[PDB]
Design an enzyme around this catalytic site. Structure first.
Site, PDB file in Angstrom:
ATOM      1  N   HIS B  42       0.798  -1.217   0.000  1.00  0.00           N
ATOM      2  CA  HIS B  42       0.000   0.000   0.000  1.00  0.00           C
ATOM      3  C   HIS B  42       0.843   1.285   0.000  1.00  0.00           C
ATOM      4  CE1 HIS B  42      -0.186   0.607   4.574  1.00  0.00           C
ATOM      5  NE2 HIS B  42      -0.207   1.859   4.152  1.00  0.00           N
ATOM      6  N   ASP B  88      -0.537  -7.307   1.725  1.00  0.00           N
ATOM      7  CA  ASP B  88       0.098  -5.992   1.861  1.00  0.00           C
ATOM      8  C   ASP B  88       1.610  -6.137   2.088  1.00  0.00           C
ATOM      9  OD1 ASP B  88       0.435  -3.284   1.917  1.00  0.00           O
ATOM     10  OD2 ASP B  88      -0.506  -2.940   3.854  1.00  0.00           O
ATOM     11  N   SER B 185       3.657   2.796   8.531  1.00  0.00           N
ATOM     12  CA  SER B 185       3.305   1.708   7.597  1.00  0.00           C
ATOM     13  C   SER B 185       4.516   1.233   6.808  1.00  0.00           C
ATOM     14  CB  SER B 185       2.204   2.138   6.596  1.00  0.00           C
ATOM     15  OG  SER B 185       1.033   2.582   7.267  1.00  0.00           O
ATOM     16  N   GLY B 186       4.594  -0.071   6.533  1.00  0.00           N
ATOM     17  CA  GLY B 186       5.744  -0.638   5.823  1.00  0.00           C
ATOM     18  C   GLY B 186       6.923  -0.964   6.735  1.00  0.00           C
TER      19      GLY B 186
HETATM   20  C1  LIG Z   1      -9.186   0.876   8.347  1.00  0.00           C
HETATM   21  C2  LIG Z   1      -7.986   1.418   7.540  1.00  0.00           C
HETATM   22  C3  LIG Z   1      -8.272   1.426   6.046  1.00  0.00           C
HETATM   23  O1  LIG Z   1      -8.568   2.478   5.500  1.00  0.00           O
HETATM   24  N1  LIG Z   1      -8.128   0.259   5.357  1.00  0.00           N
HETATM   25  C4  LIG Z   1      -8.655   0.159   3.993  1.00  0.00           C
HETATM   26  C5  LIG Z   1      -9.199  -1.242   3.675  1.00  0.00           C
HETATM   27  O2  LIG Z   1      -8.502  -2.322   4.317  1.00  0.00           O
HETATM   28  C6  LIG Z   1      -8.318  -2.150   5.706  1.00  0.00           C
HETATM   29  C7  LIG Z   1      -7.420  -0.932   5.844  1.00  0.00           C
HETATM   30  N2  LIG Z   1      -7.489   2.702   8.088  1.00  0.00           N
HETATM   31  C8  LIG Z   1      -8.358   3.799   8.495  1.00  0.00           C
HETATM   32  C9  LIG Z   1      -7.383   4.914   8.896  1.00  0.00           C
HETATM   33  C10 LIG Z   1      -6.033   4.236   9.119  1.00  0.00           C
HETATM   34  N3  LIG Z   1      -4.909   5.135   8.800  1.00  0.00           N
HETATM   35  S1  LIG Z   1      -3.758   5.615   9.830  1.00  0.00           S
HETATM   36  O3  LIG Z   1      -4.331   6.137  11.040  1.00  0.00           O
HETATM   37  O4  LIG Z   1      -2.959   6.458   8.988  1.00  0.00           O
HETATM   38  C11 LIG Z   1      -2.874   4.112  10.261  1.00  0.00           C
HETATM   39  C12 LIG Z   1      -2.121   3.394   9.283  1.00  0.00           C
HETATM   40  C13 LIG Z   1      -1.442   2.198   9.633  1.00  0.00           C
HETATM   41  C14 LIG Z   1      -1.550   1.717  10.968  1.00  0.00           C
HETATM   42  C15 LIG Z   1      -0.907   0.511  11.355  1.00  0.00           C
HETATM   43  C16 LIG Z   1      -1.046   0.033  12.680  1.00  0.00           C
HETATM   44 CL1  LIG Z   1      -0.250  -1.452  13.132  1.00  0.00          CL
HETATM   45  C17 LIG Z   1      -1.812   0.751  13.642  1.00  0.00           C
HETATM   46  C18 LIG Z   1      -2.487   1.962  13.286  1.00  0.00           C
HETATM   47  C19 LIG Z   1      -2.351   2.440  11.968  1.00  0.00           C
HETATM   48  C20 LIG Z   1      -2.993   3.643  11.589  1.00  0.00           C
HETATM   49  C21 LIG Z   1      -6.170   2.923   8.345  1.00  0.00           C
HETATM   50  O5  LIG Z   1      -5.254   2.167   8.032  1.00  0.00           O
END
Ligand SMILES: C[C@@H](C(=O)N1CCOCC1)N1CC[C@H](NS(=O)(=O)c2ccc3cc(Cl)ccc3c2)C1=O
Ligand SMILES: [Ca+2]
Lengths: 52, 234
Positions: B42, B88, B185-186
């Protein structure tokens, strides 16, 4: 029993072969003469925090 | 990273940072070898042109260990999908090899069965990054790390409003205010065994950061060991 008992005394990977523990190591380590410990082959081996 | 602590000198040497055109980090990575970085699929949509930086702990000063590397090849999992974030995982081959030194060293890749029965059943793993320090805070100028408990799979599935596939696992806390966050992330999820650190996860997603009744979701590296091996030979 075997690998379920303290990782079979292995430093790293443990596998069971015919009621017997067999130890192994990540790439960049060699298995010592005792067949359990893992020795780094060169500088900056994987998995170790750096001190120099 | 919400909570946790600063990585001290030499403590998180396998951390890589993906940087945009403006030299700003937008995703993390894990150093696997002198030519390869592990990251999340991603993340390859979060910028057109990017580079990889290693050996950095403070993005505000020159510590002398930093090195920027160009990417020769992006290897994204072909079954990755944006709707669920299933598969991912991506591997990057660099144009020039990373010279290991203080703060620059690879994490070990474990064998599948041993990692799943012995690493993934330890109490905790460690996650790290320069990501947001609050759900809607600013990114960290300091590399941080955080110890995260492995979370029971059934409990994780119950808490999630999104599908948890066989290629994912959960870690973190029910209510305590510690979690990975945006921009991590990553990045690495590693597990310590007899003072040796093995890659067990990749920072993937979560419903916010550190929310009550919600956990962090990670790509399950052990399900991808043969794929990673293939990608690194070619
Ligand atoms: C639910 C998910 C999302 O949009 N997805 C799309 C469809 O597949 C599930 C992931 N979301 C909603 C917002 C969130 N973004 S974030 O706050 O920038 C984020 C990104 C990676 C993360 C990894 C971890 Cl391990 C914990 C919190 C995180 C938060 C995120 O990853
Ligand atoms: Ca710096």
């Amino acid at each position: 029993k075997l690998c379920s008992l303290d990782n079979g005394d292995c430093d790293q990977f443990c596998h069971e072969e015919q009621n017997s523990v067999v130890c192994s190591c990540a790439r960049g380590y060699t298995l010592a003469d005792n067949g359990k410990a893992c020795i780094p082959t060169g500088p900056y081996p994987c998995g170790k925090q750096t001190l120099e | 990273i919400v909570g946790g602590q600063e990585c001290k000198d030499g403590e998180c040497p396998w951390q890589a940072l993906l940087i945009n055109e403006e030299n700003e980090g937008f995703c993390g990575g894990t150093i696997l070898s002198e030519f390869y970085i592990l990251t999340a699929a991603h993340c390859l949509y979060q910028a057109k042109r990017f580079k990889v930086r290693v050996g950095d702990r403070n993005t505000e000063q020159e510590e002398g260990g930093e090195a920027v590397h160009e990417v020769e090849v992006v290897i994204k999992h072909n079954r990755f999908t944006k709707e669920t974030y299933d598969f991912d995982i991506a591997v990057l081959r660099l144009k020039t090899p990373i010279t290991f030194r203080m703060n620059v060293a690879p994490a070990c890749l474990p064998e599948r069965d041993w990692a799943e029965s012995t690493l993934m059943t330890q109490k905790t793993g460690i996650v790290s990054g320069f990501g947001r320090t609050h759900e809607k805070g600013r990114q960290s100028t300091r590399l941080k790390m955080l110890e995260v408990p492995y979370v029971d799979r059934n409990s994780c599935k119950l808490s999630s409003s999104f599908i948890i596939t066989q290629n994912m696992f959960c870690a973190g806390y029910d209510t305590k205010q510690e979690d990975a966050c945006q921009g991590d992330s990553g990045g690495p999820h590693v597990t310590r065994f007899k003072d040796t650190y093995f890659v067990t996860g990749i920072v993937s997603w979560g419903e916010g950061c550190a929310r009550k009744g919600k956990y962090g979701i990670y790509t399950k590296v052990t399900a991808f060991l043969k794929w990673i091996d293939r990608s690194m030979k070619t």
